[PDB]
Paper text:
To allow better positioning and refinement of the atomic models in the EM density of the overall structure, we also solved three additional structures with better defined densities for the ATPase domain and DNA-binding/cleavage domain (5.9 Å), the DNA-binding/cleavage domain without the TOPRIM insertion (4.0 Å) and the DNA-binding/cleavage domain with the C-terminal β-pinwheels wrapped by DNA (6.3 Å). Despite the high flexibility of the complex, we were able to solve a structure of the gyrase DNA-binding/cleavage domain in the closed complex with DNA and gepotidacin at 4.0 Å resolution using a focused refinement strategy. The local resolution near the NBTI binding site was estimated at 3 Å, which allowed the identification of the gepotidacin density. The molecule intercalates in the DNA duplex between positions +2 and +3 forming hydrophobic interactions and pi-stacks with the protein and the DNA, at the same location as previously observed for the NBTIs and crystallized with S. aureus DNA gyrase22,25,40,41. The main difference in the binding pocket of S. aureus and E. coli gyrase lies in the subunit methionine residue (M75) that is replaced by an isoleucine residue in (I74). This position is part of a GyrA hydrophobic pocket that accommodates the pyranopyridine ring of the gepotidacin.
Author numbering:
A (entry chain D), B (entry chain B): 402 to 474, 483 to 555, 737 to 790
C (entry chain C), D (entry chain A): 8 to 252, 256 to 422, 427 to 443, 446 to 524
Write the structure that this text describes.
Amino acid sequence: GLPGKLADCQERDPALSELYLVEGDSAGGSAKQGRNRKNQAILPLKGKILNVEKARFDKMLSSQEVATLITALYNPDKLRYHSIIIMTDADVDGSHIRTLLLTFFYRQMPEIVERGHVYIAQPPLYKVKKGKQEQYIKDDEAMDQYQRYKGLGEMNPEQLWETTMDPESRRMLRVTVKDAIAADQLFTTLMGDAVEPRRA
Amino acid sequence: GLPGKLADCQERDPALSELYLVEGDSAGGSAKQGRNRKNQAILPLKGKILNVEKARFDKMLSSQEVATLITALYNPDKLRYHSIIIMTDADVDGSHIRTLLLTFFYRQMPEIVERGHVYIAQPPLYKVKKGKQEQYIKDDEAMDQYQRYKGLGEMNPEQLWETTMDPESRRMLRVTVKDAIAADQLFTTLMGDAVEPRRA
Amino acid sequence: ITPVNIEEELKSSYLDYAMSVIVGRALPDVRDGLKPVHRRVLYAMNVLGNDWNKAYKKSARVVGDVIGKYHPHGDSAVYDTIVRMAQPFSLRYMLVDGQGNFGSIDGDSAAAMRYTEIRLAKIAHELMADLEKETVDFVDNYDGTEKIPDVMPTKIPNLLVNGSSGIAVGMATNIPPHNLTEVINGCLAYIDDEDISIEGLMEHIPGPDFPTAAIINGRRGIEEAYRTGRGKVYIRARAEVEVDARETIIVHEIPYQVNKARLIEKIAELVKEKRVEGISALRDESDKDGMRIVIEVKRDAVGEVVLNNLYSQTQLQVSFGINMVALHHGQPKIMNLKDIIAAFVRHRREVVTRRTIFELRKARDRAHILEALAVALANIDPIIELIRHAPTPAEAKTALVANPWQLGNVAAAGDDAARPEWLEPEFGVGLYYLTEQQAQAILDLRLQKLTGLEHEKLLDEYKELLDQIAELLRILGSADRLMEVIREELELVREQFGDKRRTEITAN
Amino acid sequence: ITPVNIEEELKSSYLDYAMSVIVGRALPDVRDGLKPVHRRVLYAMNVLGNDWNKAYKKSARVVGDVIGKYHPHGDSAVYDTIVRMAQPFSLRYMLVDGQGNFGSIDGDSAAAMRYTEIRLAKIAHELMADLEKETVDFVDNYDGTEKIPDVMPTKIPNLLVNGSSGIAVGMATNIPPHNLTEVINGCLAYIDDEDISIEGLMEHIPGPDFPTAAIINGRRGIEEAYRTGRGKVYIRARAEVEVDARETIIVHEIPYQVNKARLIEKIAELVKEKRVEGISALRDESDKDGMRIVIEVKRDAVGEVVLNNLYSQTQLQVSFGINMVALHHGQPKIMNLKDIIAAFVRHRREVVTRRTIFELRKARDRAHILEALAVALANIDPIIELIRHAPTPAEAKTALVANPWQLGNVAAAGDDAARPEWLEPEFGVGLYYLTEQQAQAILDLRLQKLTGLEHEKLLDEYKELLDQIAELLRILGSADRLMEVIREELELVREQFGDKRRTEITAN
DNA sequence: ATCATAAGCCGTAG
DNA sequence: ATCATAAGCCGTAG
DNA sequence: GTACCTACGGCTTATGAT
DNA sequence: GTACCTACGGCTTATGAT
Ligand SMILES: O=c1ccc2ncc(=O)n3c2n1C[C@H]3CN1CCC(NCc2cc3c(cn2)OCCC3)CC1
C-alpha cells in the first residue's frame, strides 16, 4: 500500500503537492525519471479495474490501494493531496480506463469531485520535424490545419517534462458536477448500451 | 504435491508401473498426449534444482515434490514405483540437469540406486528423409557412418510414442554403484573444478 | 492554463471506445468473414514469402514481424489466435498447418512460441488468389507507412464455412460451421435462378456441421434460425447400451467445445454425491483409434434410464444459441442466409471485373511496346548508321523520334483496341511514327535479338497477345460470359476440396 | 533392450557441459572481445539492413529475427543484453543507439520490448568494416542452413576499451575500461618498436577509465595488475566540505555500478541505528545539471571525521578485482597487456592481407572481361554479319570462338599480371583469341555502347584498373607499405572518435 | 408450491 | 582477544 | 497487465564461536 | 523456468427467498 509503488515527494504540507495515475511499468519508469523531486507524486496501476455499478459489493475489493493512499475513507475528515491528475495514453483503451476511473470517483466520493480537485491531462499527439522546424501537435484538428506516440512509455523523460508536467507549459483540464443525471445509469443496463450507440 | 502436476496411471500394484521426469510445459504436454494410459506416469519439473553438496541444509527445501510423491522418506519402508526413468533433451543443459538429479539420488537414497531402479532414456538425435527413405539416428557416430531435434517438446506425440516410450522399441539404460569413490567430492570444491578440466 | 470543462466530456470519451470495438475488433464481415487480426496475420505470412510447399519456419519470426509492421497490440493475443487457427478440432477447415504441441481436447495449453513451426495450407492460397492484380483497396497502417488490403479476394464463402464468435460492446454474434460442397451447390442454385425462396436453399443445405460429429434433435431450431436470424439448437452425444453374449455404456464422441477431463471429474462428483444412481466405476481407453469412454452399469439396472438421467443432468447434451450478426457496409445488421449468399456473389462479380480490366491494360501496354520493337528489327542497317553518327544518346533518341520509317513489307491486326487509351491519334498512322518510350525500348536491345530464331518468337507472341486481348474484351462484353466463368470456377473449387458429412440430423 | 551401464557415465555428461560453457557462452576473445551473443546480434542487425542514418525500428523485429535464425536460447536473455548495450552509464562507448525508457542509475528496469526503438551507432560500422570481402571464416548455424562470421574484422581494440565480466564453470574474468586515444597511442608506439618494455606502455597508458568519473587511490594495484594479470584497485567517490560565508557535504558522482536508492536507504539506516555520528538529515537535488546529494552536518562537528567514517563504512569506497582471462586459440590463458596488443596487431595484419588479395582478384577478372569487350567494339561490322548469318545463338558463340580477330590499330599494358591465373597460355597471344565467357560477354551488349561517348569511358576504366592492380601488387610486395597503411588507418580512427579523460588518478 | 438472484465459460484485449 | 560461517551482487541461461 | 525460483566464481559485510 | 487479476453479452446451473 504505502510502500511498494507510491513514491511521494519531500513536501508534506497539503494543498501544495500533486499526484498522478498511469499504467504501471511502461510509463511509471519515465514518469519517475523525468518528474520533479519536490512536490510530485506517482502511483502506477495494473491493467484495468472492475466497474462499481456492474458489480457492487462492499466486500468486493482486490487492490484498494487508492482508497488506502489518498485518504482513510467519510472523505471530509482527511483531505491530503488537494490536487490529483489523471494521465493516460491517447489510444482507445486510454479513454476506456478514463471512463472507469471517473465513474469510480463520481460514485464513491462525490465531494472530492464537486470541490474541483480532479484534473485531466492533455499529452501531445504528433511530432513534426522538417529539418530544424520542430512542432508539437496535440489534437487531430491541429494536425489537419498544419511520428505518432502510442504510449507515454515511449518518449524520452525530458520530452515528458517539457510537454506534460511543466508548471509553465502544461495544459490541464478541470471537471465539474453540473447536474444530477442518469447517464451513469445507462452506463451498464444492457438496454441503453444496446440503444445508445445509434450514431448514424 | 499429489495433485497439480502428477498424473498417475490406472494400475496401482507396484513393481509394474513406470515414472518419468522432464521439463515442465514444453515437454509434459506431448508426454501426456502421447503416452499410454494404463501403467505410465509423468512428473514435470521447473527449471533447475539446487545442489545437495554445495548447500546442504535439512531445512533448505523448496519443491520437495519428488520426496513427497515417490515415497515417504527411510526408503526401505515404502517402495512404490519400482522403476523410474530420467528423460531430458540432448543439448548440454540436459546433461547438466542429469548430473544434478543423479547426484541427488546418490547422496540422498543409496539403496534405491543400488538395487537397480533408476534408468536413463535415449532419445533420437536426427531424422533423415530421402523421399521415401526415412531414418532415425540416435548418436553422432551413426550420423557419421550414414532435421535436428533440440528438445522433446518439438516432435509430434505419435513420434514420441514410436521412438522413446514403446515397450517394444525403446532402448533404455541401467545404472550401477560399482565402487565408493570421491568423484562427487571433486564435484564442488573449487579446486578440483579448477584442475579437472585439463582435457588437452 | 486550466479551462473549465463540463462533465459531459465522459460520454464523448466512452462513445469513442464503442465505435472502435464494433468496427475493428470483434464483428467479422459478410464478404469474407475474417476479423482484422486473421487478415493481417495471413497478409504477413504471404508477404514474408512462406507458401505451403516449402520448409517450415519458427513462430518467433512471424509473431515478431506481425507485431512490428501491422498489428501493434502485444504478443499473447496474436500467438493465441495462431494456435487457435492451427487446431484441427476447433475449425472445420484449418488454415495454418503446424508442427509441434498445439494442445488437444484435454484442455492442455499449447507449447511456448519458441518450439512450434508453422506454414500455410493448400486452402489458404485460395483465400488470397490474385492479390497483386489490383483487385481491392489499400489502407494505411498505424503510422501511415505501409499498406494493408481491406477485404480479401476470396473464392470460398468463409463466413458460412467457419463462422465466428465475438462479443462487442452492445452486440454479440455466433454462427455454426457448415459443409463445403453443400454451400457450393446452394450458390450454384442461386446463380441458376435469382428469385429462389428459402425452401429450395433449405433443401440443398440440410443443416450445420461440426468438426467432431454429434447428433442433432430438433428441426424447428435450425428452421427458425435460418429464416429469421435467431434460434437455439440442441447437441447430443453418441452412445449406446451393450451386453456381452452385464450392461455397459460406451461413448465415442462428445459435443462441440467440451473439456473431457472436466466432464469425467464432474461425473465422478455426481456419482460420489449419490445424486445419480446406477454407476459403479468409470474408465477411459482413448487411443489412436478414436475416443472411447467406458462406464460400468451397476448390476440390476436397465441402464437406459441411467442414460436418460445423464442426458438430463450431464454436459452430454448442451444447447447452442445461433445468432447471426455481421457488418454489411460498416454497420451491424442481423442477416439471414439469402442475404449472405447475395453479398458473396456480388463481391465475386466485382473482383472478376476488376481483375479482367487490369490484365487487359497490361497486355495492351506489352503489345504496344513489342510493335515498335518489331518495326525496329525490320530496318536494321539505317538505325546502325544513325546511331554511329549521332554522338549523344539523347540526340540519337531525338533523331529516331524525328523521322518516319519505311515499315518493310514483311512486317505488315484488329480494327482497333490494340493500342492504349492515353496514346494520342498522332502515332502509328506504310507510314509510321515512334514515341520516346518506344525509342528507349529500341535503344535497349541486345545482339541475341538479331538471329533467325527470335523473329518467329516475336511474331508468335504478337499473335498470342492479339488473341488474348480479343478474348478479354469479349469477356468484358456481355454478362452471360461472366456468369459462365464464375460458374466454372466455383465448380472447380467444389471438385478440388470436397468431402463428406460428419454429423447426422435426426428428426424429433 | 536394457544394456548394463557403469555409473562413471555421470562424469562424461558433466564434462561435456563444461566444454560448452567455457568456449561458447561467457569468456570473450582476445582478438575482438565479444561474447557470441553480441556477435550474432550485431550480425543480424547488419543483415537486416538497419544502418545509423535511417529510421528506427521496433525491438520486436530484431529480437524475433535473432531468435529465429541464429541464437536459439529464448528471448529474455537477448533483450536484456540489448538493453545493457544501449545504456550510456554502463559502457564507455555505447554501440546500440536507442529511444525509449532504458532505465537509469536508480535501478529501475527498462520498458517492455514493444515500445522501445533501436538502431546502430556510428562506431558500430567500424567494428564491421569490410565484412563482405571474404576476410574471415564462416561457421554453420544450429541446423547447418546459414552462415555466421567467426571473428569480426575489427578496427578498434574492443577488449581493452569496453572489457567484460563473465563467470564460467572453473574460471572467471573481469577487465576495466580504458580511453581510446591512449590505447591508440600505445599501439602506435608498439608498431614503432617491436621490443618495447612495460615501462613505455605504462607511460603512454596511465590507467583505467570509467563511464562515471571517480578518484583512484593506489598505483601498486594497477601496476601489479598490468604486469602480472591479477590485482585489486580502490574506487573513491568525489565529495567536499563546505560552509557558507554551518558545514554541509555535497556529493557529485558515485563509484562504478552502485545503486543510488540503495545507498540512500542504507545511510538512512546507519543514521537510525546510531552506528555513525554527526548526520542530521539527508536530501537529494538531482536534476538535469548533474547528480547532487546533500547531507547536513550535525552542529558542532568537524565533518571531515564524519567523512572518513563514511569512507570507511559506506559504499562510497569500493574495491575492484582486476583479473584478465580470455581465449587465445580456443583455450583460457591469463594474459597481460603486451600479449593483447600483439594479438590485435597480428589480427589486423591478417585482415588487411586477405582483403587486398580479394580486391586484386576482383579487379583482375573485371579487366579481363573489359579487354575482350573493347576488342569486340573495335571490329563492329563483321560481327554483325557473322551473327545475322548464324541462326543459332550457340552456333554464333562457337563461330565467334573459332576464328582469330584483326585487333585494329586503334586498340593497341603491363608486362604481365593483367590476366587471371586460371587462364591458360593459349588465349590472347595483332593476334588474339577469345573465350566462351568473353563470347557471351560480347553477345550481351546493348546499342547504347555504340556511340562516341562510351569508347572514351572504356579506355578510362581500363587505365584506371591497370593503375589500381599495379598499386595492389605493390602493397602486397613489401611489408613496409603494409605497416604504413595500418599506421595511417589507426591514426585516422584516432582522429575521428577521440575524447578526453573523465576519471583522475591521484597518487597515494 | 414457484421465482428473483448470483455464480462460471466461451475469445481479443489491458 | 581473533575466527569459522553465512549472506548479497555482478551476467548468460532454465 | 504484471514477480518469484534456480546455476556458475570472486568480492564485500554480518555474526556468533575458541 | 513458470500463474493470477480485470472488460465486454448470452447461455447454463446453483440457492435460498414469497
Ligand atoms: O511464467 C510466468 C509466471 C508468472 C508471471 N507473472 C508475471 C509476468 O509478467 N510473467 C509471468 N510469467 C512470465 C511473464 C509473462 N511473460 C510472457 C511471455 C513474454 N514474452 C515476450 C515476447 C516474446 C517474443 C516476442 C515479443 N515478446 O517477439 C519475438 C518472439 C518471442 C514475457 C512475459
